[PDB]
Amino acid sequence: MKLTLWTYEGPPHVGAMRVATGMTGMHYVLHAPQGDTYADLLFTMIERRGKRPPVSYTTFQARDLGSDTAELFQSACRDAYERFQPQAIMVGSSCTAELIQDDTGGLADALSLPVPVVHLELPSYQRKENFGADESFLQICRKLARPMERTEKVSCNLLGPTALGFRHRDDILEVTRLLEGMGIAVNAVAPMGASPADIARLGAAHFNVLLYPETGESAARWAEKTLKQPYTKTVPIGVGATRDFVAEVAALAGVAPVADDSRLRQPWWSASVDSTYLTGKRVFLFGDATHVIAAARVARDEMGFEVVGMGCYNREFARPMRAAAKGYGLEALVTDDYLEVEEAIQALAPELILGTQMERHIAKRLGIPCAVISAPVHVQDFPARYSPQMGFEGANVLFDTWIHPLTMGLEEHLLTMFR
Amino acid sequence: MKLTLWTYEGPPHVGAMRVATGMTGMHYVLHAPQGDTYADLLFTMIERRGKRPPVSYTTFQARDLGSDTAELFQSACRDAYERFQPQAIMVGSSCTAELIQDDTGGLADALSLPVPVVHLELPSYQRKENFGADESFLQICRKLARPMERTEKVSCNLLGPTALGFRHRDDILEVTRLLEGMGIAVNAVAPMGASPADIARLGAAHFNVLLYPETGESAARWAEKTLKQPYTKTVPIGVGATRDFVAEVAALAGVAPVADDSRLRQPWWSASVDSTYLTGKRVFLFGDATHVIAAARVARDEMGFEVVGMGCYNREFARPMRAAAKGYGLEALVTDDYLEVEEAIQALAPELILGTQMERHIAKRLGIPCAVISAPVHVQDFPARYSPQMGFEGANVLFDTWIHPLTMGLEEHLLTMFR
Amino acid sequence: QREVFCGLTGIIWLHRKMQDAFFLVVGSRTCAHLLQSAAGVMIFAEPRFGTAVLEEKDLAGLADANAELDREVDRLLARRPDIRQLFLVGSCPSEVIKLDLHRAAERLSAHHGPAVRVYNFSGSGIETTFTQGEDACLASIVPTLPATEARELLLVGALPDVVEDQAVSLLTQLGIGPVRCLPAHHAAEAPGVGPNTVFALVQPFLGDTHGALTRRGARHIAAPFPFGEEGTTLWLKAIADEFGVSAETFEAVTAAPRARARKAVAAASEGLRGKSVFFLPDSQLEPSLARFLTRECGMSAVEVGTPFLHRGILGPDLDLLAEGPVLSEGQDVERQLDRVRAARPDLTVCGLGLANPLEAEGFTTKWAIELVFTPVHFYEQAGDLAGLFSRPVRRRAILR
Amino acid sequence: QREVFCGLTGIIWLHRKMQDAFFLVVGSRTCAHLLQSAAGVMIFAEPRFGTAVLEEKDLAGLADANAELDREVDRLLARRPDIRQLFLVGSCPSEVIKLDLHRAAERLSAHHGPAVRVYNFSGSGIETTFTQGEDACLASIVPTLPATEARELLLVGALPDVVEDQAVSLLTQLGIGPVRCLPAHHAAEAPGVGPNTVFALVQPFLGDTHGALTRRGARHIAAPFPFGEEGTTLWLKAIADEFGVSAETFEAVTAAPRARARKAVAAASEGLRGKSVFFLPDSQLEPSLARFLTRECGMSAVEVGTPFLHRGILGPDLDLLAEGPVLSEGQDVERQLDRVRAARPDLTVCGLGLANPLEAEGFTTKWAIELVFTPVHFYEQAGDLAGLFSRPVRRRAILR
C-alpha cells in the first residue's frame, strides 16, 4: 500500500489502448467505472490525434454495479459493432472491473459478433502498462495472424510501434527508409500502422524487425515459433547500433546492406574540436530498457561520455539492463520509484542526465542539463517535426538533442561570467 | 564613423568567401593583410567544414607594403593554382587592400592561368556581406554560365544557397524532394553544391528557383535577361508559401501540381486545442528580409500570432519589407543597428521574439521567449539534424521551434505557481 | 457511455485552495495515473495528493487493509508534519473493496485528532464525477465544523484567492454581513456554521454542500451564480435582499464594477455575436455558462447539458436562461456527439477528451476543464470569461 | 600565407584583465567583424571593446576623420563615466590611412585629463600577430608609468585573477619585498618603474613590453615561464635568487605546491606518454609548452613553431627544451600542412581554422587559443594544462 505520486507506467489497460488506438479498424470495449474516460484524452491531446480513440467504455456506476454490469457490457459490445463498425474487436477489463465479478469473454462470445473478438486477461495490480500493450498485441496476433505463404519480394514486419510511444512515428519512417535502401519492402507495421488485415498478412513477411521489444517481443517470439519468422535482436538507435542492424537485417534477408550514410553528420560533429568539452562528461540514464541501453552505447562510444548511471523502470527487462550496465562497470537501477532514482542522481551528481520527463524535472530542480530519451513524455515532447531516435538521421537528432542542454548551460554560464 | 559593436552582416568579401566555399573547384584569392584569415574560422567551426575554405590570402605586412604587394598577389594566385588545381579562380580585395595600390585584374590575368579567372569588384566600405555573396555569384555566372540547349526533360536550378547560410543545406533537400514529387529534376544547385561545370550547365535549366533572394537575386535576373530562364518569386517558407511555390513552379514547368502533404502536421497541430493560447500572441520579427516576410506570414495566417513588429537589416530589400509591413499594418524597421531593434523591442514589449542571435540575446535579457529565424547565428544554431525552414517538413520545424520557447516559459511559470 | 472524469480530478484544484490538506487517495494504479496525468506539470512540484495503491494482498481482508492504511498515514505524517487535515478520498477499487473509510477516519482522528483532523469523502467514479469530487470534499467537512450562535454570511465554494478577495471586498463594501468562506486554507482558521449563519453558493455544483449546510440549519438563498456582469449583479442583489441592504447603496457600490464588467464582456463578445453554442455535460457550470453567453455575450444555445442538474439551487439561473435551449440530464456521448454533428454549432463547450476530435471534424471547441481552473467569477473576470470562449472562434477565423 | 589573427584578438582578454579600460578600434567593418566573431557570446554582454568604422569620407579626408574620432571619444566618455583609461587601437585600414593615433591619443589625453588617460597601441595585422596585441598594449602602458626610486618586483603578463592571486600569495609568503603587476586593473594602481625596479615575465609574447621596461632602467629576470611544475619552480627560483632569498627557505615555500603539481601533471599525462606533438605558430607560447610536454608529460616534439622567436626572453625554456625538436619560425600554411602530414603527429597544436580540417584528415588537434584564455600557468593549474592537451587524445581513443 506504498504511497504513489508518480508512476512510470500506467495500468495495463492503458497499454491495451496504445495498441487498439494505433491499429485501424480495431475498436475495443473495456469494462470500466464511469470516469476512466481520462485515458482516451492521453491520445487525444498528448499525441494530438484527431480520431477519437477506438474505445467504448461501459461506464458502470453504483446503480449498475450490483448485477447490471454484464448487461452494460453486452450493450456496449452490441453498440460498438452496430455503429463503430470495427474490423475486429478486442476485449478487456479495468482494475475496478477486475475486482467486480464480471466475465469479459463469456458476454463477447455469447453475442457471437461476426467480426473476430480477442479476449484479454491482464493482471491489473500485478502487471503494468507495457505488459498490457505487449500482451494485447500478442493476443491480436494469435487471433488473426496464421501461418501464410511468403511474399515474392523479401518482406519484413516492423513489430513494436504502438500509440503513445516515444518517437515511434519518425522511427517507423526512418527504419522504412533504411529497409527500402536495402531493397527490403515493409510488409506491415504493427500495431501502429496495422489493421486486422495487416495482422493476417503478418505471416507473409520473411522476417520480423523488433523495433521496440517492450511492446513487441511476445509477438516476435510467437511469430518465431508459429509463423517460422526470425526476428532481429538489435535496436537501431545510434550509428553503431544502426550499422549492426543493417548488417543483421541484410544477413536475414540475404540482400546486401547499402547503408545510406550521406545524411550522417553526428560522427563528424562529434569528432569536431567543438565537441572536445564533451569528453568524459558524466551522464545518468533512465527510462525504458531499450532506449537506456542504446543511449548508453551512444554516449560512451559515439559521444565520449562517461556513463555513471544506468537504470530502467521495466522490471520485465531487468536482466538485459543488468547485463548492459555490467558492461559499463555499473549496477543497473531497476526501480519503478522516482525517489530511488532521485537518490541515485543526488549521490552521483552527473554533468548531464538523459531520461524521462520526471528525470528532466529532477534535473531542473537539481540544476543539471537534461534531455528526454524515454517513453514517459509530455505533450510538448511529441514533435510536429521529423524527430527520429533510430537510424542515421536519428543519430543526428540524438546528437543535437543531447548537446542542446550542455550548449545552453555553457552559453548561460559564460554570459553570466562575462556580465 | 559610429561606435559599432555588433554588425548584422560582415565585410563584403565574406559573402564572396561563402560563395567560394559553397562551390567545389572554385578558389578565392584574396588580397588581405595577415590576420584577415579569421573568416576561415566561420566555415571550419560554425559550419563544420571538414575541408579548409578554398581561399588563399596574400597576407602582406608592413614590409610588403610599397611594391611587394603586387608580387605577393601574383605569387599567391599562381601558387594557389598549382597547389589546389581549381577549375576556376576568383580574385578579390579586402578592406585594407582597397587603399593599397592593388590591381587584382592585371595581376590575375598576367599569369595566364588556364582555368577561367573571375574578377571581383566589391566596394568594401560601402556595401556589405550579402552584396558580396550576390555579386560574386553573379560574376561567376557571367564568366562561366553561357546560353545552352535546354535539357530534354524539365529541369530546375536552385539559386541562392551559400555557405554559412541559415539552414540552406536542409532547404536544398526539402525543395529537391518537393520538385521530384512534382516531377521536376533539379539540374544544378548553386552556389553551394556546385562546380564551374555546374555553373556552365546552369543554362540547361528550364526555369530558375530563387530560394534565397539575398545571394541569388542578381544571378536570377541575369539568367532571365540572357539565358531566358524565368525565376520563381515565391520563397516556400510556410504551408501557404509552400503551396504558392508549388503552384507557381508547376505553372512554370507545365507539370501538374503534386505536393506530398502526408508529412504535414503544422496545420493540425495549430488547429488543436493545445494551441489556443497561441492566439493573439504579439511577435516581433527581425533578420534578413526573406525570412522575416515568410515568418510573418507563417505567424499571422497559420500560427495565430499577431505581428507587432517587423524589420530587416537588408537595405537592398527595404522596399519588399516595407510593403509587407504595410500589409500587416505596421512600419518596417530597416536598420543594421542592434540598439534600434532593442529600442523597438522594449517599446513594443512582444510576447515572442523571432529573429537573429542578437534578437535572441536581447529577448533573453528582457525575459521574452525567443527563437532564431534569420541568418546571423552561432555554432549552436546549425543543426546536425534535418532542420529545414522550407517545405512542409520545414513548416513542422518552424512550428516546433517557435512553440518551444513559449512552451518552456509556460511550463516554468506553471511550476513556479504550483510551488 | 459517459465521457466524464471521476471525482478524483477535483483534488487537483482543491489542494491549491487548502494549503494544509493532503488528499490521500485509496485506489488502484488507475487512479494514481489519473492524478498524475491530470496534474501534468504539477506532479513535479511535490503536490499534496498521493494515491495509496491497493495490491492483491491489500484487497483481501479489511482489518489488514486498515492496518496498512494506518501505517501509510503515519509514514505520510512523518514526512509532512505540517499537514493538519488529511482527506482520505474513496476510489472505485476502494468502494468495491468496501474499505470503511469512515471507520478509518474515526480511528485516525483519534490517533492524532487534535492536530490532524482526518476527513473522508468519496471520489469514486461509480458515485461522483468531476466537480462532484469538490462538492463531496466540502460536504465531508461541514458536518464536523463547529456550531455557531452568530448570524454570518459564508462563501461556500472554492475560488481563487484573487476572486475570493474581490468577493469579500464587494461584500464588505455592501456594508452588512461579515463573510467567512467555507473552504479553510488551513485547519487553524476553520469557520463556524449553524442555524444562525446563512450561506450562498458561488459555484453551481455544490449540491452535497447544500445538503450538509441544510442539515446544519443554515438556509439557502437562491441567486444566479457569478458568471458575468449580470450573474454577479443578481448574486449580490440576492445578498443585499437577504441582508436588507438598501437598493441605493447597492447601486452605488456596484455601479463601477458593473461598468467595467459590461465593457469587457462586450469587447470580448464582439466576436461571438450571432453564434451558436453547444454544451456537453462536463462540470455543471454549463447552465450558468449558457445564460451568460446567451444574454451578455449574444450566443444562442442549441443544448445545455448537465451531468447532474440540481434544479432547486440552479433555479434562478434557468429562470434567467431562455426557453429556447434544451436541457439534457445524463450523458450518452455517442448520441450527444451525433447531435453535435447535426447541429453544427459555432462553438462547442465539451470535455478535453472530445475536444480535439471535434475540431478535427470541423467544430470549434472550448473546454470547461480550463473554466474550473481559470478565475472567471464576479465582475473583473467577466471579460476573461467571455474571452475564454471568444478565443477559439477567433483562432478558427484567423487560421482559415 | 600565414594563419594568424591581427592583434585585435588580444583585446578581448586584455579588457577582461582591465576592468577600467575600453578598447576603441579605429578600423574598418572587417576588424569589427573580427572582434564580434572572435568574442562570440562575449559581445552580447556589452563588453568594453568597440570599433569605429572608418567611412569612405574618413579615408578621403584625414582631418574630417580626426574630428570625427574626437567627437566619438567625447560621446564614449559621456556614455561611460566609469572608463578612466581608453586604448585607441590601431588597425590595418587606420595604418594605411596613416592617421596619427599617437598625436590623437596625446590630444585627447590633454583635453580629457587628468581623469581619462588615452593610450595608443597598434593591433594591425600588418605589424602584429595573435598575442603581440597584448604585448603592444602593455608596451603602450609602460612609458606613462611613474618613475619610482624604491625597488619593487613587477610581474608583467595577463595572469588571470586567480592565477595572479596564487602568484602574488606565493611570492609574498616566499619572502620578497614589493610585488606589483603591470596590467593594473585601475589607473590609480599603476606600478612604478625605475632603474632599481626589477621585473619578471610571466607570458613569453611580451617582447616589446620587455624592451619598453628595459629603457626605464628596469632589469629583466632570466627565468623560464611558470607553465607547469618545473617551469614554475625555475621561475620562482630565479625570482628568489634575484631577491636574495635563501634556497632552503624557498624550498620550504614551494615543496607543498610542488607535490600537488607533480601529482596533477602525472594524472593527466598518462595519455600523452610516448606520443608526438606538433606546434604550429599560434601565440609564441609553443617553445615553453613543448618544454613542459617533453620534460614533464613525456611527449616527443617533432617541431615547435613560433611566429617570431625572441631568443633573449625565451632562452631558458629553449635551453631546457631538448636539442631534438627543431624550431621553425616561418609561417606558411601551404608547406606547413605538408610537414604536418609527413610527420604524422599524434597531437597537432594549430589554429582554430586548421583544427577541424586537420581533424578530418586524421590528425588529433589541439588549438592554442585556449591557452591564453584558460588559466594554465603555475602549479595548481599544471594538471589542467596537461588535461587540456590530453583530452583530444582521449576523445580520439574513445571515438576510434
Ligand code: PMR
Ligand atoms: C485526464 C487527465 C488529463 C491529462 C492526460 C492531462 C494532460 C494535459 N492537460 Mg491537463 N490533463 C488532462 C485533462 C485535464 N488536465 C487538467 C488540468 C488542465 C487544464 C486546465 C489544462 C490542461 C492541459 C493539459 C495538457 C497540455 C499541457 C500544455 O498546455 O502544455 C495536456 C496534454 C492544458 C491545455 O492546454 O489543454 C488544452 C491546460 O490548460 N489540463 C485536469 C483537471 C483536474 C484534467 C482532468
Ligand code: PMR
Ligand atoms: C575570429 C575567429 C573565430 C571565430 C569566427 C569564432 C567563433 C567561435 N569560436 Mg571563438 N572564434 C574564432 C576563434 C577564436 N575565438 C576566440 C575565442 C574563443 C575560445 C577561447 C573559444 C572559441 C570558440 C569558438 C566557437 C564555438 C563556441 C563554443 O561552443 O564555445 C566558434 C564557432 C570555442 C571553441 O573552440 O569551442 C571548443 C572556445 O572555447 N573562441 C578568439 C580569441 C581572440 C579567436 C580568434
Ligand SMILES: [Cu+2]
Ligand atoms: Cu531552451
